Design a protein around this ligand. Structure first.
Ligand SMILES: Cc1cc2nc3c(=O)[nH]c(=O)nc-3n(C[C@H](O)[C@H](O)[C@H](O)COP(=O)(O)OP(=O)(O)OC[C@H]3O[C@@H](n4cnc5c(N)ncnc54)[C@H](O)[C@@H]3O)c2cc1C
Ligand SMILES: Cc1cc2nc3c(=O)[nH]c(=O)nc-3n(C[C@H](O)[C@H](O)[C@H](O)COP(=O)(O)OP(=O)(O)OC[C@H]3O[C@@H](n4cnc5c(N)ncnc54)[C@H](O)[C@@H]3O)c2cc1C
Ligand SMILES: CC(=O)c1sc(CCOP(=O)(O)OP(=O)(O)O)c(C)[n+]1Cc1cnc(C)nc1N
Ligand SMILES: Cc1ncc(C[n+]2csc(CCOP(=O)(O)OP(=O)(O)O)c2C)c(N)n1
Ligand SMILES: [K+]
Ligand SMILES: [K+]
Ligand SMILES: [Mg+2]
Ligand SMILES: [Mg+2]
Lengths: 538, 558
């Protein structure tokens, strides 16, 4: 039993700080309260941590999500007992649905008061069970480093996700009197190898392969690089899921852009005509596949003839052969396994016919929307198209968050995606209000990046109180509101006056001819800014 | 025996019809795909006022305010996934404070459950610990049954939130088959065994107060869960000349103008109260749960009362509806199970009309005198005291002669409201007590205003609390609710106390311009910065037609 005395004499609060440092955390999103005070005071008073304060705990959660997606690091959330904890249920479920690394620390009533219906107090472990990968209540200060290390390890491994650590006030305020095992203080087969070889064989055999890439490739820093490398080496066209946008440069000649029900027809056609589908960190969602029996007939036929089919690089065993029957499953981290596979891949000089057919499709079936005519209302797709161009022309690194609704899909389709970790949107849970706090967190993660929230009026209304949080945090986020307003009529506030009340510059566009100028002013504006564009209804 | 009246209807139409059977005239909710078959059948109908928030949490707290102001259950209609998770906080709030609330959540089709579908959440699992009961409806036939069970459970025993999960295929489906009449009708006879068991404990306590040496009425929220609660409390207080103190949640149940009033008790109550719960021998607990900030460390309070519990002098009578809550905190000597109000009526006759105890109206009737509710009143030129704002507002509101309802946020202003407002009428103080949810004030005020359209509704809020749910400002305007939003702005002091003298804070949130915010949201904004403008602005605040926000810059000190 190798024992450690280095935390003896410290409070749980300081121990928490040290553990945060060991986990390479320098940013925490949260909101104070009595039960979490011993930890909050330690974090708040240390210049080693940027503590970001929202107006509502839900904001803290969504900020952490945006931070995680932008940085690849886990988002750390620190809230109090009862309502503090219940206010982060939505962001936890959101992170759980989208596979986002998040560690949620919740203050709790003292261990002596558990289950007496004390002031605040909630069965947070019970509430959050189905919306976390794992949760726990820390029972003693001795146990605090162990649970923190476990939480972070679980949150950042397999498919990433939210974990919750319940922290009773008496535990965090207590001083460690006893040495603890050294291990608890430190942060954290040939079938797989056979599968990698076989997948290399199939790829080398394929005449019309397609790479089908999702969010999983983003869960490792080297993911997109190895994806690009495999695509170049074997000359394989690449299509992405909505959550995979950014993982592959859409200006690359081999990009098929987005796959699925709302994707480019060329991408869909490529997939239906491929003899091999190489699925990398993707879930085979029905919005991507459509009717599963009609999906990838050329791949099915190739599998039946033993010359192709489907390869699935998937980290979770439970997702293997859950939707589609695969010929080869490569279990584990996609990036890691792509790296091991690379040297076994035959360098292909060209696939002239395959790319010729693809490029013909690109001519025949581009995206199409009822474009603007003189004197007509502005089309939301046009705003997004123009803004993408304007944003790129800045030469800056650009990150995009969205709310939930038609604008979300339009952003996915009509924006030109070039860099990884630049599309931050609520896909699995579809949480309205996501855009603004996610942008703030993303901006904190990437202070030099231009961060744009493409939002709808209804979604924006959900969390608009966080506008003041953006000013306070010094995050110069660019908020875009595409305002499209029997039916359901919601009374909107004056968004420009609202922004001004919150401390931001506010801009508005009603007519087609003032759009280009305002878009330039919007992006060029220093500090946070809201631009409302009055827009045509679908 | 079989009901056929619903044959041919969609689940949405059946839901609509079932709301009528439950006497629902108001639904608070927000649309989404999974709940669309229900939403459409309701949102258009003129049998129900459908109130829309900007955020589902808003709908939840609105339902709470509605419920506490009306005595009717608050009905919530939200969609699957994030719509459902967004009402967890209001459910936990309603669970802690015993508030009747029926939550209907849309859900993915039954065939999609467990496939990690779009906007799928294990809502039944999530809401388990913060509801009295929940269920997922699995067929249209089952729909009226679960609705009826929901409303009965929410409004029975200690009232509370229930959740009913509604798969889209169930609510979109058409009922083809008759269902048992028992399942479509909402829900009394008692046995002579039950009656005697009750009446025994009743008279066993009736003579104990007929003893009546040093008696005190400890009244809580339970007395408000029956319409005849306060009145039967009033005349009981008269009959035996019994002084009355209330919990935070019992405020309004007894007139504080009355000489027999002791006002609030606890670690924030009037001194004449907590001390008269020492000098008392018979503590008559009515609808209160002996809370950690009403009770101190259990050892002390109440010693001299316990002296009765070793002399047969008296002790603790506990009128409680949940037997599970008897002797779970404080060992009682007599327990009267059931509805407090009902048992008070049954005990009324067996009470000896006493008209004096003046040795009692002495130790206490003096007692203030020493200790009132001391706070450093402001001096010319100095900062505005929050207690003063509340005192003056109470007067201004009272001058209108209107029924006044007060909601609050959570924090110092919440206690100041409780302490310094003068409480007269039942169901007029609507505050988050058990969970202490910041952001409660505004949406609760809106819901309360929908429940009581003629009432003057005031939200006495804090700056940080108000920031939590301020988006519902636009919802107030859309709904027409002329709520009076008071913001006691002490932003200069931090939210977090780091240390303090025996007789210094950090964390300052950046507030928006609240007056410009109000205007952007479509309502009137007023600001007080100086003592000299306070009176005129408080009057304009109360007199103004429509929704209005008043910010008062107050003393960060105390
Ligand atoms: C009306 C509607 C229309 C839609 N239209 C489309 C559309 O046209 N196109 C589209 O793409 N989406 C569309 N969506 C969204 C779609 O439903 C899914 O949310 C999305 O496609 C899922 O993307 P994903 O599979 O890449 O991410 P995920 O759901 O997160 O799946 C990632 C997979 O990779 C695995 N994984 C995670 N980490 C790793 C790792 N390190 N190594 C290996 N594997 C890993 C995960 O276990 C998971 O199985 C639509 C949604 C709606 C509601
Ligand atoms: C910042 C803050 C400070 C606070 N400090 C104080 C303080 O100083 N003083 C104070 O009093 N409170 C204080 N509290 C409030 C405290 O947390 C509790 O909410 C409150 O004390 C409980 O009051 P209650 O027992 O009357 O209501 P409840 O907690 O709702 O208890 C009601 C009891 O009556 C029972 N009951 C319900 N209905 C019936 C019925 N029909 N018939 C019979 N029985 C019934 C219930 O089962 C329950 O046992 C504070 C709250 C906050 C947020
Ligand atoms: C008691 C408690 O748990 C308080 S009081 C309080 C600050 C109140 O600020 P406000 O300005 O609104 O009130 P003021 O005191 O009068 O200034 C906080 C952060 N909390 C914790 C907290 C945190 N988050 C939420 C959702 N609810 C609560 N109760
Ligand atoms: C919290 C929450 N409530 C409800 C929904 C259901 N919902 C999905 S999109 C939408 C309307 C959003 O419209 P908007 O935000 O303005 O974007 P738009 O479709 O107009 O582009 C709703 C209510 C949701 N996804 N999340
Ligand atoms: K594109
Ligand atoms: K009072
Ligand atoms: Mg919209
Ligand atoms: Mg304040």
């Amino acid at each position: 039993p190798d024992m450690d005395t280095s935390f003896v004499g410290l409070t749980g609060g300081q121990i928490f700080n040290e553990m945060m440092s060991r986990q390479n955390v320098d940013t925490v999103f949260g909101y104070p309260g009595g039960a979490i005070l011993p930890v909050y005071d330690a974090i708040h008073n240390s210049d080693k941590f940027n503590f970001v304060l929202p107006k509502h705990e839900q904001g803290a959660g969504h900020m952490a999500e945006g931070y995680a997606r932008a940085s690849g690091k886990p988002g750390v959330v620190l809230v109090t007992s009862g309502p503090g904890a219940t206010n982060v249920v939505t962001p936890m479920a959101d992170a759980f649905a989208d596979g986002i690394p998040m560690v949620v620390f919740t203050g709790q009533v003292p261990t002596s008061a558990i289950g007496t219906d004390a002031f605040q107090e909630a069965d947070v472990v019970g509430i959050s069970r189905s919306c976390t990968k794992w949760n726990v209540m820390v029972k003693s200060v001795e146990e605090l480093p162990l649970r923190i290390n476990e939480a972070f390890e679980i949150a950042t491994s397999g498919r990433p996700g939210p974990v919750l650590v319940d922290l009773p006030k008496d535990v965090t305020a207590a001083i460690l009197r006893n040495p603890i095992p050294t291990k608890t203080t430190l942060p954290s087969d040939e079938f797989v190898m056979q599968s990698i070889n076989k997948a290399a064989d199939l790829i080398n055999l394929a005449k019309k392969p397609v790479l089908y890439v999702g969010a999983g490739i983003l869960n490792h820093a080297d993911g997109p690089r190895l994806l690009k490398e495999l695509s170049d080496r074997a000359q394989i066209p690449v299509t992405t899921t909505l959550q995979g946008l950014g993982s592959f440069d859409q200006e690359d000649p081999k990009s098929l852009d987005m796959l699925g029900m709302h994707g480019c027809a060329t991408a869909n056609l490529a997939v239906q005509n491929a003899d091999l589908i190489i699925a990398v960190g993707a879930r085979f969602d029905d919005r991507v596949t459509g009717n599963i029996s009609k999906f990838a007939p050329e791949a099915r036929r190739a599998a039946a003839e033993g010359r192709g089919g489907i390869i699935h690089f998937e980290v979770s065993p439970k997702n293997i052969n859950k939707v589609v029957q695969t010929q080869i499953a490569v279990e584990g981290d996609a990036t890691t396994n792509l790296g091991k596979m690379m040297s076994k891949i035959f360098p292909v000089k060209e696939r002239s016919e395959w790319f010729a057919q693809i490029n013909k499709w690109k001519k025949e079936y581009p995206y199409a929307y009822m474009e603007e005519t003189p004197g007509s209302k502005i089309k939301p797709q046009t705003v997004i198209k123009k803004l993408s161009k304007v944003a790129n022309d800045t030469g800056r690194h650009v990150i995009v968050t969205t709310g939930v609704g038609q604008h979300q899909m339009w952003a996915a389709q009509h924006w030109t995606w070039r860099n990884p970790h630049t599309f931050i949107t609520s896909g699995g849970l579809g949480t309205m209000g996501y855009g603004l706090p996610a942008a703030i967190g993303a901006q904190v993660a990437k202070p030099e990046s231009l961060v744009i929230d493409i939002d709808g009026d209804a979604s924006f209304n959900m969390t608009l109180t966080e506008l003041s949080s953006a000013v306070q945090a010094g995050t110069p986020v660019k908020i875009l509101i595409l305002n499209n307003e029997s039916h359901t009529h919601q009374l909107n506030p004056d968004f420009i006056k609202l922004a001004e009340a919150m401390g931001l510059k506010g801009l508005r566009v009603k007519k087609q001819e003032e759009l280009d100028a305002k878009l330039k002013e919007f992006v060029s504006t220093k500090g946070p800014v809201l631009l409302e564009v009055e827009v045509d209804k679908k």
